Each structure stands twice: as structure tokens, then as C-alpha cells.
């Protein structure tokens, strides 16, 4: 399907499926790794 190949070559992606996850707004969550690792290694 060559016309479809032209379609594909003329198409950009606004959000791949990982980008789709985050939602309507962005929350930092950069502290979550630190706090989670600490609290769950205290239980370790």
C-alpha cells in the first residue's frame, strides 16, 4: 500500500503510549524514588 506509506511518512506522533500515561497535569514525583526506597528498605 504505497499511498499508506506516504500517509505514514507524513505523520507525526503527539504522544506515544508512555507519554499517554501521565495524564492531564504533571506532578513532580522526583522525591518518590528516594522516599519509597528508604521506607521499603526500612521494612527490609
Amino acid at each position: 500500500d504505497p499511498v499508506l506509506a506516504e500517509t505514514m511518512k507524513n505523520e507525526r506522533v503527539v504522544q506515544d503510549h508512555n507519554s499517554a500515561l501521565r495524564g492531564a497535569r504533571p506532578i513532580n514525583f522526583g522525591y518518590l524514588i528516594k522516599d519509597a526506597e528508604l521506607k521499603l528498605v526500612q521494612s527490609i
Binding site: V14, Q15, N18, I27, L32, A36, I44
Partner: protein
């Protein structure tokens, strides 16, 4: 009228009649210099030799000859007096011959050999005259003028200053006052203009007006030149207009007025109506002035510009190669540079970039400050795949032309196109990539600043598109959308219908990303109105934009995309989903089709995601065997850190973790949560799984905080239900209940209304059990009733029917504390539920409760009586 004539001003007009005395006193032979001049100077030479005529009569008649356009005839006539007058009487004759040969070497209707011959004859007669009378000002002025005409400008200035010094000294020695010599002042002002000292030359050219407003060479030409070079075109054009008004036969003044007409037509015009006639008058004047000055390089270059703007590129090349190139050594370097610039423009428009490069290079060789020629050279470098070379050219131009709007636009587009290239992202580190993006934004935003400051000029609408692309690459959707909108406005604020298809489509995609799909469908259809590829693309976009309203309008477009182009993966995924979630399918023909689509595009990831969602989310494949196998397969022997499938694996592994290997599985899930949080902190679902693990194992303090934060981005029913779960576990009811009604009004999920009503029974359990409450218990019971109804109606026969029924039984029992009627229904349902001790308690409690409630009711009726 080759002489300045103004009412009230002096006049430097020659005696129009000369009468010669006859030898021995019949002293009236009239010779009228306009009319009675023989075309053969020998006829008057005989008269002059006969009557022993004076030397000045010879000179006077020869000057009258030369001032009528017959310089060769007068030259001959004085050359005939050279062998008559002899020995120091011929000094003034040599001065006249010097100046006449100087006049003959003035014009581009000449040759290099002819000009050299006339200049050499001039300086030869000058040597002869200096031999006799070296201090007569005619010879000194001829010296300085010869130096000027041979290009030796600072040497001429040196000798002119020395001559002025000597004259001042001689006059100061003899007590007489030195008046300014207008010719020395003129020469000095021209030499200073050559020195690029425009202010001093302007002052001299202005003082010459006061000393003599009739001076031919009109100083006004020079004051206009200096006004122009000092960035005052108005007064320059005014002075040239004055010079033409004073002598309508001055051709330099007319050509300057013509250039000024072109300039004013291009700048002062406020609309195309005024411009098309001002420029037309300029072109007609150009034609007329050209018809008798066909060797004029300025007029020829003007013709070149016109024919370029007319599309006649061959005539530009012809003017260059057939007129200018032949008289090339005789014309000034700047005019040559501009004509070569126009030849190069013609080459550039014809696609010949080698010749255009050569021509712009020649133009720069003749005038390095030819700004537009350097721009053409940079554009030729762009065309010749010399990108970095063009950027070097433009950035070197930027040091002096920092506020040039077109140059900022060019450099910004260049840097942006370099930034949006994949090769450069592969070749250089990321920080350099972002510095490049920043530099492109720098140039483009400075261009926008410069163009808005001059509120008369229109913005090139593309710069906003490029800024939006630059911000889009960095996932800053907000600024990109704002710049795309700003481009749409200005784009539609000129030519209201020709906006490119892609602007409305991409704006609609952005409006789909954030907010509802009302304007997105509008823009998608406006793009559909105005290429086979665009049809498929925006048809998928419209079908994807309707999945919330007229779901079945989406189904049809999806089918006909698949009914004619059965290889668009997104169309098939979304189609199977939409009609699946709209219930035009059974679980078997899903699998088949989905499996057909699964291992069709087996290897890569998007389809797989949908595959995972099928198994996990709704029908048959909840069994984890396939899930483990395939959601691992997404990561087996690939390096993919991708978030969806590995997060599914992690969280559905912690679902199994729900007992030393339980510790094992919990720490595995925590590990994977951290790992996926590393690559993307904004991954809301990883933080939500961490809130789950925090909330599950009795650390429901920070978990509620994390969930409260998560709801600021995610707004699904799932995470909010999770929120309301942790609040019931942690504390009292309103935080728990307040969120369950908000769950129900989040989505029309008929399965989660079941999911809601049992834990709603729990929520009203906890606080009617805090203390006896007879008004709240009944609405608790109502919610539990709706629970059991929703569980009996559906094809769901889980533990839910049993448990829902009991919770209602306990609600009935506690409400009996139309009271007896609910009590009887409670007895009935608890008998239907008939562990052992509980049902024997039920027997004794029926015996107690039915009678005791009848007692309470009769007591209540008796006290209602009174």
C-alpha cells in the same frame, strides 16, 4: 540652458557677442557666438591671423566653440594659434588645451585608450604651461584635477592643501586678503567625500552655496550626496530636486531625482494604488532619461532591477554582458558591484548557483560592503549544500547588522532546522542540542521584536510555526500550542482562506490532548474540507475524536479505513476496542481477530500493549499464564525500559504478592516501580503503585498524601476509588463516603456501581456502628438494596451476591432497633441465609424482636394518642 539661472542670483554667463577690430581702425566686425561660428575654425583663423588679432580673441572664440559642443573644433583652433603665437605667449593656450583635453576625458561614451590619450595630452599641455607660468591658478587647479582624475586622491589632497598654504602665504606677505577659491573648496570637498569624511565635505559643499549659488558644478549635488551618506535621504533628495529645479538641463541632477523617486515610491507609499503609479512615473522618467543616456551604468542597472522584478532574467544578463562588461574599467566600483549583484540575482533565479556564486563574489570584490550581495552569497551557499559555510557568512554579517530582521530570520531558521535534525541529535551531546535550540529561539524572537517595534511591517507567519516546532520537540505542549495559535491568527489576518491543511489539523490534535473534543472535531473537519494521505490521516483523527460522542460515527469511519486500507494499525486497534466496548462483538471473534492482529505485527510494541490490555482488562484471558508470558516477552532479550508493559508486569506481580516469597514479590515490585520512576518521574501510574504498596501494608499516612497528589493529574475512577479506599481504612467516613458519590459521578461504569455499593455498605457500617443512628441506617440500607439488585441483575455471580445479601440482612437487623415491616423482611432474608450459633441466635432473636417491636409500636401509638 547649461547655466544656472535663478531670479535675484548672480549669473556666470559668457559674453554672447564678440566683435573684432579691423587692422587700422574700422573697429567693428561683429561675430555672434551662437550663430556665426563657422563649422571650420580655419575660416576664423584666417581672420585672426590677418588683423594681427590678440591672443584672448583666439581663446574666446575657442571657448565659445567648446561651450557649444564642439570641443575638438576649438582645440584645433587654439592648436592653430600655437604656431602663430610664440614663446611664453602660448602659456595660456596650453592651459586652455589642458582643460579642453580634460573635458574630452569625461564620459562613459568613451574608451580606455581614448581616455588615456586625452589625459596624457592634458598633462603634456600642462607641463608646457608650467614651463612658462607655473604659478597661474589655472595650471595649479589642472594639476590637482589631473591627480583626481588619475585616482590619486590623497596625493591630490596633499598638493591642494600645499597650494592653498602657498597662496595664503603669498597674500599675507603682500598684505592682501585671501578669498576662498571655490574650485579648491570643491576639489577638497570631493576628495573628503572620497575619504568618507562626509561631515567636512558637507560643510564645504554648503558654504559654496553662500559663496556662489550659481557655481556650476552644483554643490547641491554634493550636499545631497553627503546628506545621503549621513543617513538623511529626505534632505538629499530635496537638494537634488533643487539642483534640477535650478538647471533643468543638469543630467546628474535628473538621475539623482530619478533615484530619489524610486526610493520615495518604495518607502513613502501607503498602498498599492499609490505605489503602482509612483513607481510607474519613475519608470517612465527612467525610459525618457535613458533614451539619450544609453551608456549610463546607473540607468542600465535600474533597467536590470526592473527586468528582474519583471521575470525577464535574460535581459538582466544581457545588460551585464553586453553593455556594462564592455565599459567596465570606466565606471565606478559601486555601480559595477550593483550591476554584478543583479546579474547574480538573475543567475540565482534561473537555478545556476555556480554563476550566481561567481557574480556575487565579483560584486563583493568591487564593494565588500554590498550587504545584499553578501546575503545572496549566503543563500547561494545554502543552495549549494554549503550549510555551515552559509551560517559562517551570515554570522559574520551579524556583527555589523545585528538588528537586520531578515538576517535574524535566516539565522534562526538555519539553527532551528539544524536543531530539528536527527543526525545532529545522534552526533552531539544533549546539552549542545539544547544550546542550539536556544540560539535558534534567540534569533527568531529578536526578529519578532524588531518587526513589531516598527509597527508598519508584517510578520512572516512561519516564524511562529518554527518556534512551535522547537518547543514541541521538548514536550512543552503549552507554548507550542500558543505559538501555533498565534501563527493561525496572523496567517488568517492576511489571505483568510489559505492556511495550510496541517495547521488546523495539528491545532485540533493539541485541543484533543488538553480539554474536550468540541473544537478539535471542528478543526479536523475544516481540514477535511481542503492528497490521498491526508484523507486517511484526518479520517482516523475524526474517528478518534468522536469516541465520546457518536461512538458509532467512529465505528463506521474505522471500518471504511480498514475496508480500504487494511494495514493502519491504529485504526484496527481503536476499531476493535470501540466496537468491543460498544458491544458489537463476542469474546471469541475478538481473540481470533485480535490474535490475527497480534502476531501480524508481532515484534513491536504498540499492538502488544492493546494485547495486554485485552487479556488483563475484560474478557477471557485474566488467567495470568499468557500475561506472564507475553508481558515478559515485551522485555525479554530487548533492552527496552519502556513503561507500559514492565509496569503492568510489576503491579500485576504485586497483585500475586498479596509468606517469605510474599516478601520476595513485594520487594520485586518495589524495585520495578523505582526503575520505571527513574526514566520518567511524571509516570503517574508508578507513583500510584507506590502509593498502593504504601497503603496496603498499613503505612496509610504518606499513601493518602501520594494519592491526593496523584488526583491532581489523574482523574479516572480507578485512582479516586483507591483514594476513597485508604480513607475508610485509615479513619472515619466522610473522607471515605464523600469520594464514593464523586466516584459514581465520575463515569457511567456499571461494574463499579456494584464495586461501589458493597464498600458503601461498609462506609455506613462504620458510623452507624459508632453509635445507634436510626435516620442514617435507612439510607445505608437503601444503598445496600441497590447493591444486591445490581448484583442479581447481571451475569456476575461472585461472592458478591452472598455477601451483598448478608450486609443487607445486618442492616435490616440494626434498623429494627414502618419499623416492624422492615423487621419482618429482615427475618425473612436472614432465614433465607440459614453459622450455627448465629442462626440459633436468630431463632431466639426473632422470638425477642418481633414481639418486643410490636410492644414498642403499641407504646408509641398510645403516647401518640395523648
Amino acid at each position: 540652458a547649461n547655466t544656472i539661472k535663478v531670479e535675484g542670483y548672480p549669473s556666470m554667463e559668457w559674453p554672447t557677442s564678440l566683435d573684432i577690430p579691423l587692422k587700422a581702425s574700422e573697429e567693428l566686425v561683429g561675430i555672434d557666438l551662437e550663430t556665426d561660428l563657422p563649422d571650420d575654425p580655419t575660416d576664423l583663423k584666417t581672420l585672426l591671423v590677418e588683423e594681427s588679432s590678440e591672443k584672448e580673441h583666439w581663446l574666446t572664440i575657442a571657448l565659445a566653440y567648446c561651450n557649444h559642443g564642439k570641443t575638438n573644433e576649438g582645440i584645433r583652433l587654439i592648436e592653430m594659434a600655437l604656431d602663430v603665437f610664440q614663446n611664453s605667449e602660448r602659456a595660456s593656450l596650453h592651459t586652455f588645451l589642458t582643460w579642453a583635453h580634460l573635458n574630452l576625458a569625461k564620459g562613459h561614451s568613451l574608451s580606455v585608450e581614448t581616455k588615456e590619450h586625452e589625459l596624457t595630452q592634458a598633462e603634456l599641455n600642462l607641463k608646457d604651461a608650467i614651463g612658462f607660468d607655473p604659478t597661474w591658478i589655472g595650471n595649479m587647479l589642472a594639476t590637482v584635477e589631473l591627480y583626481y582624475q588619475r585616482g590619486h586622491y590623497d596625493k591630490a589632497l596633499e598638493t591642494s592643501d600645499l597650494f592653498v598654504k602657498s597662496i595664503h602665504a603669498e597674500d599675507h606677505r603682500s598684505g592682501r586678503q585671501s578669498k576662498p577659491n571655490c574650485l579648491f573648496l570643491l576639489l577638497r570637498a570631493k576628495l573628503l567625500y572620497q575619504k568618507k569624511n562626509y561631515v567636512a565635505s558637507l560643510k564645504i559643499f554648503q558654504e559654496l552655496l553662500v559663496i556662489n549659488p550659481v557655481l556650476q558644478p552644483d554643490p547641491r549635488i554634493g550636499i545631497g550626496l553627503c546628506f545621503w551618506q549621513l543617513k538623511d535621504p529626505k534632505m538629499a533628495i530635496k537638494s537634488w530636486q533643487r539642483a534640477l529645479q535650478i538647471n533643468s538641463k543638469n543630467t546628474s541632477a535628473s538621475i539623482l531625482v530619478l533615484l530619489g523617486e524610486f526610493h520615495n515610491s518604495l518607502t513613502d507609499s501607503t498602498n498599492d494604488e499609490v505605489f503602482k503609479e509612483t513607481f510607474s512615473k519613475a519608470l517612465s522618467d527612467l525610459k525618457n532619461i535613458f533614451s539619450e543616456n544609453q551608456n549610463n551604468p546607473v540607468l542600465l542597472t535600474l533597467l536590470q532591477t526592473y527586468h528582474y522584478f519583471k521575470g525577464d532574467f535574460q535581459t538582466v544578463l544581457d545588460i551585464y554582458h553586453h553593455k556594462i562588461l564592455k565599459m567596465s574599467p570606466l565606471i565606478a566600483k559601486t555601480v559595477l558591484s550593483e550591476s554584478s549583484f543583479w546579474c547574480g540575482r538573475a543567475h540565482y533565479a534561473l537555478g545556476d548557483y555556480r554563476k550566481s556564486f561567481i557574480m556575487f563574489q565579483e560584486s563583493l570584490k568591487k564593494n565588500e560592503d554590498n550587504l545584499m550581495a553578501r546575503l545572496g552569497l549566503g543563500q547561494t551557499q545554502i543552495k549549494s549544500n554549503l550549510l555551515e559555510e552559509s551560517i559562517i557568512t551570515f554570522e559574520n554579517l551579524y556583527k555589523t547588522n545585528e538588528s537586520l530582521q531578515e538576517l535574524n530570520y535566516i539565522l534562526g531558521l538555519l539553527y532551528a532546522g539544524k536543531t530539528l535534525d536527527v543526525k545532529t541529535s545522534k552526533s552531539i551531546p544533549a546539552k549542545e542540542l539544547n544550546k542550539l535550540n536556544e540560539k535558534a529561539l534567540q534569533y527568531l524572537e529578536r526578529y519578532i521584536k524588531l518587526t513589531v517595534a516598527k509597527k508598519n511591517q508584517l510578520i512572516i507567519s512561519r516564524v511562529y510555526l518554527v518556534i512551535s516546532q522547537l518547543y514541541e520537540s521538548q514536550n512543552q505542549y503549552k507554548i507550542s500550542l500558543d505559538f501555533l495559535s498565534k501563527a493561525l491568527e496572523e496567517m488568517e489576518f492576511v489571505n483568510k482562506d489559505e492556511v495550510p491543511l496541517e495547521i488546523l489539523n495539528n491545532l485540533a490534535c493539541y485541543h484533543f490532548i488538553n480539554g474536550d473534543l468540541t473544537k478539535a472535531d471542528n478543526l479536523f473537519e475544516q481540514a477535511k474540507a481542503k492528497n490521498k494521505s491526508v484523507n486517511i490521516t484526518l479520517e482516523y483523527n475524526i474517528a478518534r475524536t468522536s469516541e465520546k460522542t457518536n461512538w458509532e460515527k467512529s465505528e463506521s469511519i474505522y471500518s471504511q479505513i480498514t475496508s480500504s486500507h487494511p494495514s493502519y494499525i491504529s485504526a484496527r486497534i481503536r476499531n476493535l476496542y470501540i466496537k468491543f466496548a460498544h458491544s458489537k462483538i463476542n469474546d471469541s471473534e475478538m481473540n481470533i481477530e485480535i490474535n490475527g492482529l497480534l502476531e501480524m505485527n508481532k515484534s513491536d510494541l504498540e499492538m502488544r500493549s492493546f494485547y495486554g490490555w485485552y487479556l488483563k482488562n475484560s474478557e477471557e484471558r485474566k488467567n495470568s499464564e499468557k500475561s506472564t508470558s507475553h508481558n515478559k516477552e515485551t522485555l525479554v532479550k530487548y533492552n527496552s525500559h519502556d513503561a507500559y508493559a514492565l509496569i503492568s508486569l510489576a503491579n500485576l506481580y504485586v497483585t500475586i504478592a498479596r509468606q517469605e516469597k510474599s516478601k520476595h514479590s513485594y520487594l520485586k515490585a518495589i524495585q520495578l516501580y523505582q526503575k520505571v520512576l527513574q526514566i520518567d518521574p511524571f509516570n503517574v501510574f508508578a507513583a500510584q503503585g507506590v502509593a498502593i504498596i504504601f497503603a496496603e501494608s498499613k503505612r496509610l499516612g504518606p499513601a493518602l498524601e501520594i494519592l491526593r497528589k496523584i488526583r491532581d493529574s489523574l482523574d479516572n475512577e480507578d485512582v479516586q476509588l483507591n483514594l476513597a479506599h485508604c480513607l475508610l481504612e485509615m479513619r472515619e467516613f466522610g473522607k471515605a463516603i464523600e469520594n464514593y458519590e464523586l466516584v459514581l459521578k465520575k463515569f457511567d461504569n456499571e461494574r463499579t456501581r456494584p464495586h461501589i455499593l458493597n464498600l458503601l455498605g461498609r462506609a455506613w457500617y462504620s458510623r452507624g456502628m459508632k453509635e445507634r443512628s436510626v435516620s442514617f441506617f435507612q439510607k445505608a440500607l437503601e444503598n445496600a438494596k441497590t447493591a444486591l439488585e445490581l448484583f442479581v441483575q447481571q451475569s456476575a455471580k461472585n461472592k458478591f451476591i452472598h455477601s451483598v445479601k448478608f450486609n443487607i440482612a445486618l442492616l435490616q437487623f440494626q434498623i429494627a432497633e414502618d419499623s416492624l415491616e422492615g423487621l419482618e423482611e429482615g427475618l425473612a432474608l436472614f432465614k433465607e441465609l440459614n453459622k450455627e450459633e448465629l442462626e440459633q441466635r436468630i431463632q431466639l432473636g426473632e422470638t425477642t424482636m418481633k414481639s418486643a417491636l410490636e410492644r414498642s409500636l403499641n407504646e408509641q401509638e398510645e403516647f401518640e394518642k395523648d
